[PDB]
Design a protein around this ligand. Sequence first.
Ligand code: MG
Ligand code: MG
Ligand code: MG
Ligand code: MG
Length: 46
Amino acid sequence: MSRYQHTKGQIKDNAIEALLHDPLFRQRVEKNKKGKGSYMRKGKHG
RNA sequence: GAUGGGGUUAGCGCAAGCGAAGCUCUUGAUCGAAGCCCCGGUAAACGGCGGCCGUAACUAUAACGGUCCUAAGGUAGCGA
Ligand SMILES: [Mg+2]
Ligand SMILES: [Mg+2]
Ligand SMILES: [Mg+2]
Ligand SMILES: [Mg+2]
């Protein structure tokens, strides 16, 4: 178990909130397999 | 000195009184400039150069916004 090194510096008011506005809890959006962000130049096995 | 208002009195009414001309006391139409008000300009003229409330990826701050006021809200630079 290693410590996550957050980008908030010195947390003052609330830790969880701070974390939430951090890269660790950034939004993740998946790449489309079909649809908009869907075009693949080369396959996984291409 | 325009007009008005008085004072005096030649004269007239059987009389309270009225009262010419003059002189005279007063009122002050009209005329009448600059100034002042007025309309602009001028700050290396004298001078003056704002508040309150909110707002961002913990927190804090607030580039941002709201509103009131002003002739205008302090620029560059500097700053216990
Ligand atoms: Mg004049
Ligand atoms: Mg000027
Ligand atoms: Mg300054
Ligand atoms: Mg000191």
